[PDB]
Design a protein around this nucleic acid. Structure first.
Ligand code: MG
Length: 644
RNA sequence: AAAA
């Protein structure tokens, strides 16, 4: 009777019920009754016999709109001495016909101006609605304006909140905080930061010491909880955002205002900074022996980029730093190699595969797509952050403190069987493990025995699909791909609300519990599930916003390459055609089913192939193809290919 | 899937 609408292909879709089974009903376009993608609706099952698979339904009323504002392009034209207004919504799932309120239209608003509009009224029976312009965003051809519109359509806040900035600008460095008995003075240690070249939020610094029996690792994380009081205005805004947002052009929407993100909580060189340290001692094989968590004070001696460290590694450059930094980095790389070997021994799933970024010019127009490369410096930092995250998760669990975990379940036997069949057609080995009990180690060994297969890329793509998304949970579930029974996010409280919450839990229960009330502790405990829920729901939106922006920028880039031939492989097959991932740009283009040459092709959902009725020719995931870019679909932001 |  109640559920969330999702619109898909041709603006038909389905409703996922709120009942305990999450029962799914199909809904055709004609039974939507004015409802839009993501709306909460009241629905009824259709009296129809079941066509199969699922029941069908019709929307009765809209209980809550998913959005109040919608992006679109505003058009104005004059015809028989009268102004006519039209809006084209950016979102192809916005299917309602719009009547534009003339009193919402400024006299100076020109044609082809991006706007945001709201729905004033709608007629569910005719799919007609009255809308008013609520914001003027800018030139509709401007790619940065489009990126901002795409954030608005995904409910992603990006405008500066002046109240929050003013609250932040009051904050200052308390010089006496370093003298607190609970805060360890580590200002003499050769901490440094290692980050991408354009990052200005330095949340994490590392220092590694060698001892006779092994190593001691210090991971120092900006002490964000010490500056951001829970339920302060700054906190509430961070909780709404849930995370910093990173889109192309190094365009960042920070979770926290820049007085925190780039000054008080940024571990900038030669500045005294307050941190939370995860300190771990290792033996000479990289096995963890002991750990300690505590507030501290550091002075980073150097900020480095991945590029700088990597060139140093390959003896193609020197680092202009003190010898203590040089020895710490050398020990960090040695330790990092050892940690990586232990984690592989215990079981971990390295799901690395091809990644790209879009290069844009100073006006945010896309220039080209670059493939990213494995990064020795980036990998070292990754190993160190992972071991800290895992250790903090276990410390909180060992002390029986409820926390939000980062979790990732074992996939079902069913989904594994499907994956094994698909990749077996690409000469990927059939695995030997039990499908009910398969461990992280066994998936890793299976990946490793196929590393040289030409189809390794789509193998990892499909494995990732099989495994599904990681998410946050207070329930103590495993992280299958990291390979731990307990994992959380601790190292990045400048950009992630979960890490900020993890730091608050450390403060309130382990660092200075005497300074907090039992209610504060229970209140936060009671709120943890809802925090995880909001972060999980917003993470969906962020990923969708990145997808929208990627498709917008890449199809704009490709719009100048019509007629060009691209080689690639099939990444997906649907009832409407073949998705071919192009080698040169890693982007999926659509080959429409109806115009594939030489035969009439039928979608078979079981093996998810297209099979020709006369010739038995088969298209399957992984096949190598060549195709011509024939058009850009600017409505759906798709690249359409035709087989050549 | 992980890492800033
Ligand atoms: Mg960092």
């Amino acid at each position: 009777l109640q559920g969330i609408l999702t619109l898909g292909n041709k603006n038909s879709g389905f409703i996922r019920s709120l009942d305990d089974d999450k029962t799914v009903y199909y809904v055709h376009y004609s039974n939507l009754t004015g409802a839009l993608d993501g709306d909460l609706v009241e629905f009824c099952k259709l009296d129809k016999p079941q066509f199969g698979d699922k029941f069908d339904a019709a929307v009765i009323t809209i209980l809550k709109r998913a959005r109040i504002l919608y992006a679109g392009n505003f058009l104005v034209d004059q015809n028989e001495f009268a102004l006519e207004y039209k809006i084209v919504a950016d979102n192809p799932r916005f299917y309602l016909t719009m009547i534009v309120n003339p009193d919402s239209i400024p006299n100076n608003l020109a044609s082809n101006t991006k706007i945001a509009f709201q729905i004033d009224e709608y007629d569910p029976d005719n799919n007609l609605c009255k809308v008013s312009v609520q914001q003027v965003l800018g030139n509709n051809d401007d790619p940065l304006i489009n990126i901002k519109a795409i954030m608005l359509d995904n409910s992603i806040v990006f405008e500066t909140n002046d109240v929050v900035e003013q609250h932040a600008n009051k904050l200052s460095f308390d010089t006496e905080e370093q003298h607190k008995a609970y805060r360890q003075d580590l200002t003499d240690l050769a901490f440094v930061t290692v980050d991408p070249t354009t990052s200005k939020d330095l949340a994490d610094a590392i220092y590694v010491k060698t001892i006779p029996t092994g190593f001691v690792l210090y991971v120092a994380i900006a002490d964000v909880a010490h500056y951001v009081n829970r339920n302060s205005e700054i906190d509430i805004e961070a909780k709404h955002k849930t995370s910093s947002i990173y889109l192309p052009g190094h365009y960042v929407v920070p979770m926290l205002p820049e007085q925190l993100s780039n000054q008080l909580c940024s571990l900038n060189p030669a500045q005294k900074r307050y941190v939370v340290v995860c300190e771990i001692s290792f033996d000479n094989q990289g096995r963890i022996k002991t750990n300690k968590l505590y507030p501290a004070t550091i002075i980073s001696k150097n900020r480095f980029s991945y590029d700088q460290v990597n060139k140093w590694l390959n003896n193609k450059s020197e680092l202009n730093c003190d010898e203590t930094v040089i020895n710490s980095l050398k020990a960090a790389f040695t330790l990092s190699d050892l940690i990586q070997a232990q984690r592989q021994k215990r079981g971990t799933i390295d799901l690395s595969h091809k990644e790209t970024e879009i290069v844009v010019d100073e006006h945010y127009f896309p220039i080209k797509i670059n493939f990213l490369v494995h990064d020795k410096a980036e990998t070292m930092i990754e190993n160190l952050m992972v071991v800290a995250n895992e250790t903090v998760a276990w410390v909180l669990t060992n002390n029986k403190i409820a926390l939000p975990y980062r979790v990732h379940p074992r996939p079902s036997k069913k989904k594994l069987q499907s994956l094994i069949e698909t990749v077996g057609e690409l000469n990927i080995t059939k695995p030997q493990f039990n499908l009910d009990t398969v461990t992280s180690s066994q998936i890793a060994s299976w990946l490793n025995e196929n590393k040289d297969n030409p189809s390794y890329e789509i193998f990892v793509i499909l494995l990732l699909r099989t495994l599904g998304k990681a998410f946050y949970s207070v329930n103590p579930l495993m992280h299958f791909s990291i390979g731990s029974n307990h994992y959380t996010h601790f190292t990045s409280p400048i950009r992630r609300y979960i890490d900020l919450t993890i730091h608050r839990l450390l403060w309130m229960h382990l660092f200075t519990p005497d300074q907090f009330t039992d209610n504060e502790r229970d209140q936060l405990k009671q709120e943890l599930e809802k925090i995880a829920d909001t972060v999980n729901d917003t993470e969906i939106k962020i990923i969708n916003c990145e997808r929208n922006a990627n498709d917008y920028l890449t199809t704009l880039l490709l719009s100048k390459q019509i007629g060009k031939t691209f080689s690639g492989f099939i990444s997906a097959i649907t009832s409407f055609g073949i998705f071919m991932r192009m080698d040169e740009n890693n982007f999926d283009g659509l080959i429409k089913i109806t115009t594939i040459p030489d035969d009439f092709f039928i979608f078979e959902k079981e093996k998810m192939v297209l099979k020709g009725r006369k010739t038995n020719k088969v298209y399957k995931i992984g096949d190598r193809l060549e195709a011509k870019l024939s058009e850009i679909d600017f409505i759906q932001k798709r690249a359409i290919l035709t087989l050549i």
